[PDB]
Specification:
The PDB classes it as photosynthesis. Chain A has 73 residues and is mostly helical. Chain A has two helices and no strands. Chain A is 23% helix and 0% strand. The N and C termini of chain B lie far apart (51 Å). Classes of the chains: A mainly alpha (73), B mainly alpha (40), C alpha+beta (81), D mainly alpha (751), E mainly alpha (78), F alpha+beta (141). At the C-F interface, strand 1, strand 2 and strand 3 of C face helix 2 and strand 7 of F. The structure holds chlorophyll A (9 copies), 1,2-dipalmitoyl-phosphatidyl-glycerole and chloride ion. The site of one chlorophyll A has 11 residues of chain D, from helix 4 and helix 9.
């Protein structure tokens, strides 16, 4: 489909499950708002001393901590 | 005759005939309705 | 050295293994376990090369003659030098 | 009792059976009839594969040499029918689906195109703009050039050729049916080798080139002379108008005024107007001179017609081939050729091996001759056409050669009689095959070390920053001195050793740089250290292929390991794990390995050709005359290392195939990936073994039994020999398709 | 600057060259042909040296004579 | 065993014959009586001529002698079932090998002792774990 000059007809499956897992650990990029990606969550309202640093690391696109994924992945 | 029928009914003739029928179906369906990546 | 050639009690005495053997490893000896009243024997396994022609020939449901390859000698390696 | 003609014996050596095989359709409905082992019934899926493997094995089907000969004759007829259908389809697509007339009107500013893709699922992008508003796939077969050389002008002539090709195919088909079922020639008829040879040299080759010389003089040459002058194809009279108006022939060639009298009175010189010997190329079109080719075909007709008289048939004069064979025997060869006439008249595989060898060699010769002496108009301008035809004829020749080795081995297994071969050539070669094969092995090792080893030395020296220690024209030179000397002799031939030749036979040996349009048609092809190394690589690979195949033939009967191999047959997997393991001892397996090695050799040959022509030949000439080659003359310094071939040849020139997406050449990149895939796929069959696959089939069959879907024809893993056949077939297909895509994309992208 | 061919056959090309080559070819054929008289078609009353030993021998040696003669004519013609 | 007689077959020579092993290690001999001078296939490549009467031939291996023996007994008009095969050592010692008791092994014969016999099926061999840390395999017990 890309050879014939029509790359818009690609079957591109979004890896929704791994993105959702990333969200559960705090990755807000996808907007799933589940567990550590939701401030109201009981999993995130614990006062865990690691949570601010873990979120700050996992939500900056400057490292290899849960690299953003797409149909290629 | 019966031998010609038994030959035209052999496995390669029948499998190529069915493959041709299915290819015609798919090619024509994509001719009149192309680019169906998914259902609306 | 040599390979090991065993003959089991499912032998029907058809002798096809002896005819297949290209090195005269096998013989037919009298027996009473089958109708043919004969069983295959391997009295010269020191000449056996292990080409498995006997096993190819055996008709019984899984072979009644079995060749287990063992220690390699110049006779068993089919060497002419 | 079908259609019975009178007789047609003509009081000749004809002897036929009136109706041995009756016509019926029932054996069509019984697949496997020709083999006793298959007529019973398929119990395992192996029966299926065998049904295709023994289809043409007529020897294993029947013991009557006469029936085998009749089968082969009728199958030859059916094969000619298939080829006639193919050629007629070519002419039909050129007639009704090609821009042949638009191309003829302006060949320089247009590209040869046939086959229009149907616009669907986006494949309509494959209809690239070839010129004059025409959109299609560009063809590299060079059909348009052969057609312009023949004298074609209208699509209706090509359509008539296509209709005639269909009719000729029907003729060949009916002839095969009639000569196998009705009048079937006896065995005694095929064994007249003197008669057959006289006819083939005189009637097939001689009369063929005679008739084609007639057509070239009457149709090709005048139309091509009018095309080269620019009279335009719509204004040139039809070919028959030159026969109906001999004044029109005299106005183009005044020699036609004097009539046939110079021929009958041996006054041939006045025929200089159309019987010429110029030598070089046409300045307007870059091809060979059609008058030179007409004179050539005329002399070839003369030579072949004369040669068709040496052998004796019914009238006493001639030669007995058995006599000539039996006469030749010396102090080194005992009885020489005593017994060869008998095996070359009762064994089909012997003739087949000889003929495959010579035909493959001849096709390689055809590639190497047609590239440097472009016989067709505007052929050398199209580097894609040139490269494509070259590599195609190369591959065909190599395959025919591998088949020659195969059928030599088959003859040895099936038709060898030791009583009929006592102390002759065959006997003594079998008696010193150890000497032969050991020396060929040593030559192969010496060639591998002294060709590829030079490349490895150069890679290591260059990597270490030691260019002065390399093998190259600028360091340790390895000059192809003898080839350079022969090139120089060729250059000086016209006017000296070739007085009546105006120009050199091929400008690849030297001379001016003949250029048509913006591109260079042909120019001298210099030879240096890199050429030396590549040529010795060619020598090495050809010698290794010959080693494998010759060993396969010479030991197909026996070896020190397997002394009774002749009883095992031509084609068998092994003779056990014993004796250390005896895998691939058969002649068939030697053919199997020789296939890979011929692929290796020919891949290197075509890579050498492509790179050398892109570096030191093809290019653009300026109005000043400056030649800018396709890849800027990079061969001499890059083709001396393997990294040079990986970077400047493969990696560099692969840029067109990979970026072909979204363009008309995208199918080439697709087939590129496809060839890579099939090559990788073959490695599963070649690297594994039947036992694993059968055991896996066991569990899959158990799962079928669980749901009661097990088939009555039990699934069996591919046989050992079949595993290898699948492996080699897919290896060759994948690799050749990869390089087909690579070559076509690269050559079409460089304009 | 091609090969000149005598200009017209008249008396020199024929007889003096062609007939002589045919005669000498007939001599060498009568001297060296193995199966002299056994063709499917036989020869009419022998007498001289033309159809004395078979139509096949005569025809083959006349063909060879014309080969020799064409060679001679074209060669000496310069 | 004693001495071996017979005439060498008519043959001009091959590269496939005996090597250093024949003198250094062991060799094999096959004798047979032929009714006439007839051509046969040499197991080492080529065609040889056997003579009427007795013929002795020296080969490199026992399998080569047995292949020649099968060819003699299967490919000749009056079949030759008379060939005897011996193992020849460089000490001059000759050892009669085939056919063992004067009778081809394909057919039964009295006075033959069974060897390699196993009084059970294949599926009745013991488990290797039951015999590990011995030196035996399940077929050797
Ligand atoms: C093997 C996996 C695979 C899958 C997932 C797809 C999927 C798809 N491809 Mg693709 N393709 C593949 C392999 C695959 N392809 C390969 C190997 C190639 C190389 C040859 C291609 C090359 C390719 C091209 C060139 C194109 C596609 C296109 C398409 C799309 C067209 C679908 C369509 O409408 O067709 C037909 C739709 C149908 C419904 C046909 C079925 C009709 C049946 C016969 C009737 C049955 C109905 C039944 C009676 C109803 C009963 C209901 C029941 C409840 C009672 C589709 C989403 C097209 C596209 O544009 O993509 C968007 C297109 O142009 N593919
Ligand atoms: C109503 C609009 C329409 C129009 C404008 C066309 C136009 C065209 N069609 Mg199409 N087609 C249509 C409807 C239409 N079709 C429908 C509704 C179907 C679904 C059944 C098809 C399925 C179809 C096929 C399979 C083929 C065409 C083909 C063709 C072309 C040749 C016509 C012909 O009869 O030659 C010859 C016709 C045929 C060879 C097949 C006739 C099609 C019938 C309906 C199906 C028969 C196939 C058979 C049941 C199973 C295949 C086995 C095989 C050995 C035949 C033509 C330009 C042919 C083509 O593309 O040429 C290369 C062709 O192969 N069409
Ligand atoms: C109506 C025509 C007709 C009929 C019914 C028969 C009948 C028969 N032929 Mg015969 N024959 C024919 C035409 C015909 N033939 C032609 C045209 C030729 C010239 C090539 C021959 C030459 C010939 C030979 C040499 C032999 C037979 C044999 C046989 C018998 C074996 C059955 C068989 O062929 O298996 C089934 C065959 C098929 C289903 C054919 C499938 C297509 C094959 C695989 C390839 C097609 C290539 C094609 C022929 C080439 C031209 C095609 C091109 C125009 C596209 C059978 C009774 C064989 C025999 O004696 O049996 C022991 C045999 O050796 N025939
Ligand atoms: C020499 C071999 C050869 C080859 C490989 C081709 C190749 C091709 N031809 Mg051509 N052609 C040939 C010979 C050949 N032709 C000959 C001899 C003629 C004169 C009769 C023609 C006349 C012809 C015409 C008129 C056309 C083609 C077309 C085509 C293209 C489409 C094929 C197709 O879809 O048909 C259709 C196939 C089917 C519907 C299925 C076949 C039925 C199967 C075999 C039955 C099997 C089950 C039992 C294709 C690339 C078409 C084209 O170029 O498109 C622009 C087209 O219009 N061809
Ligand atoms: C001058 C006489 C003559 C000619 C023209 C041929 C020609 C041919 N023979 Mg034949 N042959 C002859 C005499 C002749 N033979 C005799 C006397 C014998 C008995 C010993 C044989 C026995 C023999 C065998 C055993 C075989 C052949 C085969 C062949 C074909 C293989 C070559 C090929 O494929 O090239 C290219 C093919 C072509 C160009 C096909 C066109 C030629 C047509 C069919 C005949 C010419 C038409 C006719 C002469 C009138 C047209 C010319 C006129 C208008 C001026 C070939 C067409 C092989 C075969 O069967 O091939 C199918 C084969 O197996 N020949
Ligand atoms: C199979 C090959 C072949 C065929 C079918 C022909 C056929 C023909 N040739 Mg040709 N020719 C051939 C080979 C062939 N030739 C070769 C090899 C040469 C080179 C020596 C020639 C050179 C040649 C010449 C010089 C002439 C012919 C002429 C003719 C035509 C005779 C008309 C005539 O003599 O009236 C008499 C003509 C006049 C009085 C003027 C005739 C249709 C004659 C012609 O005019 O061509 C149409 C003519 O003069 N041919
Ligand atoms: C080193 C010696 C030598 C060499 C170089 C060749 C090489 C060649 N031979 Mg030759 N052959 C040889 C020895 C040799 N042969 C001897 C000693 C004899 C006497 C028995 C023959 C008799 C022989 C014949 C009768 C023919 C050849 C033909 C050929 C050419 C085949 C080309 C081809 O396959 O294309 C395509 C094939 C063809 C155009 C014609 C195919 C002819 C048939 C199919 C093959 C021969 C059938 C065979 C004689 C049947 C009888 C054998 C047995 C069943 C009794 C080829 C170049 C053929 C040829 O055309 O010569 C120019 C051919 O007609 N050979
Ligand atoms: C004039 C040439 C010629 C002749 C007439 C023969 C004749 C014969 N050969 Mg031989 N051979 C040839 C060329 C020739 N071959 C070449 C060029 C090679 C090198 C590859 C061989 C190597 C060879 C071997 C190794 C063997 C034979 C065998 C045979 C015999 C069985 C025929 C057969 O294969 O069954 C039917 C044919 C087939 C099943 C072929 C189909 C499979 C092909 C290879 C697939 C190719 C795919 C296609 C080209 C490209 C891919 C497209 C795909 C996706 C559709 C037969 C008498 C066999 C034999 O037993 O000898 C007695 C055998 O063992 N030949
Ligand atoms: C890159 C892959 C590769 C290589 C290098 C080889 C190597 C070789 N093949 Mg082989 N082959 C291959 C792929 C390869 N094969 C594949 C895929 C197949 C399956 C089809 C085969 C099947 C095959 C067959 C059937 C045969 C060969 C043959 C040969 C030998 C030819 C003689 C020769 O070239 O002299 C020697 C060349 C070399 C050893 C290449 C390396 C030399 C380097 C440059 C020098 C090394 C310097 C020094 C020694 C390094 C020492 C390091 C130090 C620490 C000790 C050769 C050793 C033929 C043969 O045996 O000919 C006699 C033969 O019969 N091959
Ligand atoms: C640059 C070329 C380099 C090669 C020169 C050295 C030649 C090597 C072998 C010497 C003898 C062969 C020459 C006499 C040719 C010849 O026939 O000699 C004569 C003799 C047989 O001749 P007869 O007297 O028997 O002639 C009667 C014939 O009708 C026999 O049927 O041949 C032999 O003695 C057998 C050995 C030949 C096999 C040796 C070939 C080895 C392969 C070497 C390949 C080199 C490549 C050459 C390049 C094309
Ligand atoms: Cl480099």
């Amino acid at each position: 489909v890309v050879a014939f000059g029509t790359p818009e007809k690609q079957i591109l499956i979004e890896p929704v499950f791994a993105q959702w897992i990333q969200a559960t650990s705090g990755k807000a990029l996808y907007g799933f708002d589940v567990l550590l990606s939701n401030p109201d969550s009981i999993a995130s309202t614990t006062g865990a001393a690691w949570l601010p640093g873990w979120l700050d690391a996992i939500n900056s696109g400057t490292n290899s901590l849960f690299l953003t994924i797409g149909p290629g992945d | 005759m019966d031998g010609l029928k038994s030959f035209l009914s052999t496995a390669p003739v029948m499998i190529m005939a069915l493959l041709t029928f299915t290819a015609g179906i798919l090619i024509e369906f994509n001719r009149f309705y192309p680019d169906l990546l998914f259902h609306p | 050295m040599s390979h090991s050639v065993k003959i089991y009690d499912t032998c029907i005495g058809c002798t096809q293994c002896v005819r297949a053997c290209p090195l005269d490893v096998l013989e037919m000896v009298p027996w009473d376990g089958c109708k043919a009243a004969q069983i295959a024997s391997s009295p010269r396994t020191e000449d056996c090369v292990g080409c498995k022609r006997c096993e190819t020939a055996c008709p019984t449901d899984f072979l009644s003659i079995r060749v287990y390859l063992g220690a390699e000698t110049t006779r068993s390696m089919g060497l002419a030098y | 009792m079908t259609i019975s003609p009178p007789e047609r014996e003509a009081k000749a050596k004809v002897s036929v059976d009136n109706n041995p095989v009756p016509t019926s359709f029932e054996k069509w409905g019984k697949p496997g009839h020709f083999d006793r082992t298959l007529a019973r019934g398929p119990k395992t899926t192996t029966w299926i594969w065998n049904l295709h493997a023994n289809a043409h094995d007529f020897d294993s089907q029947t013991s009557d040499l006469e029936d085998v000969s009749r089968k082969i004759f009728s199958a030859h007829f059916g094969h000619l029918a298939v080829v006639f259908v193919w050629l007629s389809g070519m002419y039909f697509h050129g007639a009704k689906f090609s821009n042949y007339e638009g191309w003829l009107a302006d060949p320089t500013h247009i590209k040869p195109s046939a086959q229009v893709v149907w616009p669907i699922v986006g494949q309509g992008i494959l209809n690239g703009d070839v010129g004059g508003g025409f959109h299609g796939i560009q063809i590299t077969s060079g059909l348009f050039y052969l057609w312009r050389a023949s004298g074609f002008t209208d699509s209706y002539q090509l359509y008539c050729t296509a209709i005639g090709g269909l009719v000729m195919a029907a003729l060949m088909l009916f002839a095969g049916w009639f000569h196998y079922h009705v009048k079937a020639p006896k065995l005694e008829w095929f064994q007249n080798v003197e008669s057959m040879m006289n006819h083939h040299l005189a009637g097939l080759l001689g009369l063929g080139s005679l008739g084609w010389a007639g057509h070239q003089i009457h149709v090709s040459m005048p139309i091509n002379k009018l095309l080269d002058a620019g009279v335009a194809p719509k204004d040139i009279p039809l070919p028959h108008e030159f026969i109906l108006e001999p004044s029109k022939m005299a106005e183009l060639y005044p020699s036609f005024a004097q009539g046939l009298t110079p021929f009958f009175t041996l006054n041939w010189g006045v025929y200089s107007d159309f019987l010429t010997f110029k030598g070089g190329l046409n300045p307007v079109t870059g091809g060979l001179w059609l008058s030179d080719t007409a004179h050539h075909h005329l002399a070839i007709a003369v030579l072949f017609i004369i040669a068709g008289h040496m052998y004796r048939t019914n009238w006493g004069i001639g030669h007995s081939m058995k006599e000539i064979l039996e006469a030749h025997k010396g102090p080194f060869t005992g009885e020489g050729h005593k017994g060869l006439y008998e095996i070359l008249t009762t064994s089909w595989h012997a003739q087949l091996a000889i003929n495959l060898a010579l035909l493959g060699s001849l096709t390689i010769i055809v590639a190497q001759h047609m590239y440097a002496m472009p016989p067709y108009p505007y052929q050398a301008i199209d580097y894609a056409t040139q490269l494509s035809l070259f590599t195609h004829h190369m591959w065909i020749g190599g395959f025919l050669i591998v088949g020659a080795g195969a059928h030599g081995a088959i003859f040895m297994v099936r038709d060898y009689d030791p009583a009929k071969n006592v102390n002759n050539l065959l006997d003594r070669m079998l008696r010193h095959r150890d000497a032969i094969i050991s020396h060929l092995n040593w030559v192969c090792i010496f060639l591998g070390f002294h060709s590829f080893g030079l490349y490895i030395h150069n890679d290591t020296m260059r990597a270490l920053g030691r260019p002065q220690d390399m093998f190259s024209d600028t360091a340790i030179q390895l000059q192809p001195i003898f080839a350079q000397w022969v090139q120089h002799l060729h250059t000086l031939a016209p006017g000296a050793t070739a007085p009546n030749a105006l120009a050199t036979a091929s400008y690849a040996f030297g001379g001016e740089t003949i250029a048509v349009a913006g591109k260079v048609a042909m120019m001298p092809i210099t030879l240096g250290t890199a050429d030396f190394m590549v040529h010795h690589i060619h020598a090495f690979t050809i010698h290794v292929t010959a080693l494998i195949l010759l060993k396969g033939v010479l030991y197909a009967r026996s070896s020190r390991l397997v002394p009774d191999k002749a009883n095992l047959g031509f084609r068998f997997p092994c003779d056990g794990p014993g004796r250390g393991g005896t895998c691939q001892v058969s002649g068939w397996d030697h053919v199997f390995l020789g296939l890979f090695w011929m692929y290796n050799s020919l891949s290197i040959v075509i890579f050498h050709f492509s790179w050398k022509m892109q570096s030191d030949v093809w290019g653009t000439v300026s109005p000043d005359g400056s030649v800018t080659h396709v890849t800027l003359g990079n061969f001499a310094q890059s083709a001396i290392t393997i990294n040079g071939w990986l970077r400047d040849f493969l990696w560099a020139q692969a840029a067109n195939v990979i970026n072909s997406y979204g363009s008309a050449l995208s199918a080439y990149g697709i087939m590129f990936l496809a060839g890579h895939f099939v090559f990788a796929f073959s490695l599963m069959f070649l690297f594994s073994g039947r036992g694993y696959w059968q055991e896996l089939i066991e569990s899959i069959v158990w799962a079928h039994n669980k749901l009661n879907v097990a088939p009555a024809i039990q699934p069996r893993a591919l046989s050992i020999i079949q595993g290898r056949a699948v492996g080699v077939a897919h290896y060759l297909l994948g690799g050749i398709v990869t390089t087909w895509a690579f070559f076509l994309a690269r050559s079409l992208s460089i304009g | 600057a091609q090969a000149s061919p005598t200009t017209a056959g008249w008396s020199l090309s024929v007889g003096i060259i062609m007939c002589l080559c045919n005669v000498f070819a007939f001599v060498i054929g009568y001297f060296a042909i193995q199966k002299t008289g056994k063709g499917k078609d036989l020869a009419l009353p022998q007498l001289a040296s033309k159809k004395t030993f078979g139509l096949p021998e005569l025809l083959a040696t006349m063909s060879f004579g014309h080969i020799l003669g064409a060679g001679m004519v074209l060669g000496l013609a310069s | 065993m004693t001495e071996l007689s017979g005439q060498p077959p008519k043959f001009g020579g091959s590269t496939g014959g005996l090597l250093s092993k024949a003198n250094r290690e062991e060799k094999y001999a096959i004798t047979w009586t032929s009714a006439s001078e007839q051509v046969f296939e040499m197991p080492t490549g080529g065609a040889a001529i056997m003579n009427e009467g007795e013929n002795l031939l020296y080969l490199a291996r026992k399998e080569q002698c047995l292949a020649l023996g099968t060819q003699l007994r299967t490919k000749f008009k009056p079949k030759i079932q008379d060939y005897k095969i011996y193992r020849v050592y460089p000490s001059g010692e000759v050892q009669y090998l085939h056919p063992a008791d004067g009778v081809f092994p394909e057919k039964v014969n009295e006075g033959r002792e069974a060897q390699g016999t196993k009084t059970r099926r294949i599926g009745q061999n013991p488990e290797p774990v039951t015999i590990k840390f011995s030196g035996k395999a399940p077929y050797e017990v």
